[PDB]
Design an enzyme around this catalytic site. Structure first.
Site, PDB file in Angstrom:
ATOM      1  N   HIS A   1      50.749  35.059  52.773  1.00  0.00           N
ATOM      2  CA  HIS A   1      50.283  34.627  51.472  1.00  0.00           C
ATOM      3  C   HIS A   1      49.212  33.559  51.639  1.00  0.00           C
ATOM      4  O   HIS A   1      49.356  32.636  52.451  1.00  0.00           O
ATOM      5  CB  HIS A   1      51.467  34.084  50.652  1.00  0.00           C
ATOM      6  CG  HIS A   1      51.239  34.104  49.174  1.00  0.00           C
ATOM      7  ND1 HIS A   1      50.467  33.162  48.528  1.00  0.00           N
ATOM      8  CD2 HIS A   1      51.661  34.968  48.222  1.00  0.00           C
ATOM      9  CE1 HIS A   1      50.424  33.446  47.238  1.00  0.00           C
ATOM     10  NE2 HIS A   1      51.143  34.535  47.026  1.00  0.00           N
TER      11      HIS A   1
ATOM     12  N   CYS B   1      53.220  37.191  41.128  1.00  0.00           N
ATOM     13  CA  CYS B   1      52.175  37.921  41.834  1.00  0.00           C
ATOM     14  C   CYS B   1      52.762  38.824  42.920  1.00  0.00           C
ATOM     15  O   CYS B   1      52.368  39.989  43.050  1.00  0.00           O
ATOM     16  CB  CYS B   1      51.141  36.924  42.411  1.00  0.00           C
ATOM     17  SG  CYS B   1      51.776  35.525  43.522  1.00  0.00           S
TER      18      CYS B   1
END
Lengths: 330, 330, 330, 330
Positions: free
Chosen positions: C176, C149
């Protein structure tokens, strides 16, 4: 269509605006609040809880343009200056929290509107109406109140239970999402000390008149309910936990069947029913003001039971504000 | 002093370890879990919920040294291999959650320990004991259980209320902090679907036998209580919300006065009492297993009332595990 | 249409499933995981992060039926038993995290599938592909990886910056969201101690090879980037913060104009561009793997600048897994 | 002892009060804010972030009594009315955020105090001082500023790095805890739109002059640093992430050794050093304004490196406010 003006662009004002867009009987034509038009456009376009606005938002010369329609934007601190007739407003959605008496909210009518719906419980004798409980009791008044989010959850459930089995007495708790009146860290809240403590750190005990207020829209339950609340670190969606003593013995299956019947019948669209393994986010966006959680409740015996019902304290209430606007404009 | 071995270094194992340090009747001499000694030292030294360990922690050659004392560190999957007699262990604190029957927990005695205290409700007929409720009922058994954190909150409060006024029937809800069995995001939990949903996003309905289990340590309340739980996005500290019907009419002032008397008398140290504007973090570190919140409760009338009591579901329980170890070693 | 089988129904498996529904070139026909069909239906129907499934979900006799289509549901621990040919699977989406080598993932081909796409960075030399960076480099291989990702966020932005101005060197941080590998409270994580600490309580420093991995899909940047991460208490959506030294002097306006050109041109649909006052929830559901935040970045001078780019670490990646499936099936 | 008055009882005012209690050179004798004495006692006694006050708190006739000492409590909106001489105040800790210019803060001296320390960056040319950076530069001024929490983290670290290796240029990010200026849900913040979005739902990009302000206390770094911030859903403790280009080549081991030397030498007590697997809660209560995280940083090469440093944005800053009060009273 009914021409509606929104006074106050807080959480309720903005979610009422969004819910109005799917409706064909109601048009928002004006918004009043102490915010510039480009900032209002911003708050409408992006929502942390409900996602991006489904439609177009633009500012053309101090005028909001939402899905092609000009919205008049004003910033009057005194509703008597609002000149609602200049934009043709039939009903004002009074959502500032500051004009919850007849004397104050009638300033909207002075300013050219026909009727007013307060988006909170009235502070005087202004009548209150909760869909599923007493809309039929509306007798033409020009200023009304839609009560509170928690009363909108509790009153329809309590009517079903009381009509089928007879509520002798009940105590309720709502585990309630964090709201705009709370603080991000421990800060000042001199009228409610617990409510100043940091919202994301704490389970916060809190007061509520929602259970007592049920006795106002459902006078047969007057004096028979009260309750309290806990605020918890979630951004939206709340749940009531209703402990009742029943006059007529009723198994849990009978209670389930009676709520499901109401949700598919008289109270379709206000009272919902589920038997799934739901959690709170499953009701983010819920339009029913009261979704009965069949699996979560528990009975001690056939006359003493705890019932669980979910509500999106933003979305459900906001939709029923519109339903009340439509109902009194009939 | 009583020589204690800890089996399992999860949340309860580590908070029992920390609480043992302030005590002069109990020494932890050994810890078993599938963790290296340097990692155990790390988990002991830093705690997100309770801060840095108050003392010294070092590893000298696969041996934990905590405030100057060697702790034996082993990693046996089968408790029969634990050789507790080699380090002189009188009582094992069984805190893995995996040996909650007599057949399984007696493996500790096979391995040289005299007695065992399960840090959770037993799964067979192993007797349960809750301080303030039935420690006096202990009859010399060599394997016992300290029940659950929520039973430790509910049972002392329920005994006071029932002894003074008579509980006809009660339903309870606990608004419970997130625990290690939950998931950070929506994940698999095939025995409990709601419990797999993301813990920080959700109010999560949950089952509990704690209210029923009160009828085991207080058999006069057998069949008279049940309840459920909601898990909410807080890391620690929970609250019970107890709705009871009373045999003898009792004003809220009388209920308050009776709980305060217990907290200053027979139940000092297990049952606490406050009238301040507390929220959940005010009980982070609380050693009482049940702190009555006088301002938060509410009565509908003199025979139907909702009572609120706080508990640190880590700290209080862990201290009473030690109290039970001391009591059965008498 | 391409017939796809999903191995592993975790976060990525389920969001790939949802994103597949809007596509007309791809059909999910089978799902393998150690979950019953009725539980899979539950995880698909309700999502704390992305709301209720937009469509119909039913179980008819151990078969999932989703928007009218039978989905084969199996529970094989060994992919060689999967018999993908029996349901006609062209490409397997390998999303368990357990078969990230050629030896292990080729078991899917043994079982009758033509090609495999790993939904994470490969652990051997299996080639990696990131849309916007090197899809054109695909040379017919039958096992590929869509990288991670964060690489999907960083690589398209880094290509634009490097193609226009020349990256001498860069260091990146990703703030994150919390993920499924974290713990709800302080728990065991013996390969990554910080990552065991309670996810909702902490800013948690974390390692990542995403910046180094950019040098694999964009070999001109090999050795020129590295970075780290902080995990923070949000359920979804992350942001990269890229600090680069530039060979060619470039004002911030020139950088903005070059990213916007890419987002409207070659990289339309993978790289996005905004100048609004966005926060992380504004990208919940985002299909672009990299949305440049023009207002948030800052330059010290014309050769040293910090660039900000958003990504939905679930949704964007999942859509590009499908794009890679489509690309290699061409 | 130095007699200190606190103006403003917000987060900083209260944590300065708590930190003053451990000191023998400083006594708080008066507090001014628009809060009743019993409410001030409440905010002092219970803290969601830092636990219960370690000491005694009582109200005897509109006077706070804290660990036996009468604290004068007033509620003046205009500091000229404060009559600081009547209670003997040497230095005012100006912590309202409203008097950050010489013209406004000198009203405290008009009212009988000798000197003033602003607990935030000055808005005019009032000199700023950061411990570890430029306390030695204090030249007897009677109104000073302790700069900001983030400057207090960044400036000591930047001085060590620049003194040993020479900072050519740096860009910093602070991942910053939520603060009192944020909103619990999406609400109005017309001067900072992103900052109105719900604090617990979002990563929120934010501006900061802390990096530029380093060039004011360390003029050799003037023009060489700038940065930005992200606000994240934690209640306390922040971290700076400093990306610097170095004039003299320096391995990461050399950087580590130089920071550790400073933390054990010249900058003991302001700059800390750790090599453990820390997360943010491990610094809740930290008195050092800057704790270097050796394991978390990363170097691309010997002249380009990213450095990580923790700070309790409440506790560290508050202690250095006291250090500055002591320093200018010398």
């Amino acid at each position: 269509t009914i021409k509606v003006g929104i006074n106050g662009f807080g959480r309720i004002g903005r979610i009422v605006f969004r819910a109005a867009q799917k409706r064909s009987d109601i048009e928002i034509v004006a918004i009043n609040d102490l915010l510039d038009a480009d900032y209002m456009a911003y708050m409408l376009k992006y929502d942390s809880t409900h996602g991006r606005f489904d439609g177009t938002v633009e500012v053309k010369d101090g005028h909001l343009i939402v899905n092609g329609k000009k919205i008049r934007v004003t910033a009057e601190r005194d509703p008597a200056n609002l000149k609602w007739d200049e934009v043709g407003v039939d009903v004002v959605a009074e959502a500032t929290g500051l004009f919850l008496t007849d004397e104050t909210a009638r300033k909207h009518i002075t300013a050219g509107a026909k009727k007013v719906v307060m988006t909170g419980p009235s502070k005087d004798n202004t009548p209150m109406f909760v869909k599923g409980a007493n809309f039929d009791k509306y007798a033409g008044q020009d200023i009304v109140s839609n009560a509170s989010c928690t009363t909108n959850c509790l009153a329809p459930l309590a009517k079903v239970i009381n009509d089928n089995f007879g509520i002798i007495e009940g105590l309720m708790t709502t585990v309630h999402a964090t709201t705009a009146t709370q603080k991000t860290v421990d800060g000042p809240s001199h009228k409610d000390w617990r409510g100043g403590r940091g919202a994301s750190q704490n389970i916060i005990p809190s007061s509520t008149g929602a259970a007592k207020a049920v006795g106002k829209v459902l006078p047969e339950l007057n004096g028979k309910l009260t309750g309290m609340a806990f605020r918890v670190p979630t951004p939206n969606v709340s749940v009531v936990d209703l402990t009742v003593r029943l006059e007529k013995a009723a198994t849990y299956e009978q209670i389930k069947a009676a709520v499901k019947a109401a949700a598919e019948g008289e109270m379709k669209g206000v009272l919902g029913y589920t038997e799934d393994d739901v959690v709170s986010t499953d009701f983010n966006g819920e339009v029913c003001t009261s979704v009965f959680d069949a699996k979560a409740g528990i009975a001690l015996n056939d006359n003493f039971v705890k019932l669980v019902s979910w509500y999106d304290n933003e979305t459900g209430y906001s939709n029923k504000v519109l339903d009340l606007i439509a109902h009194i404009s009939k």
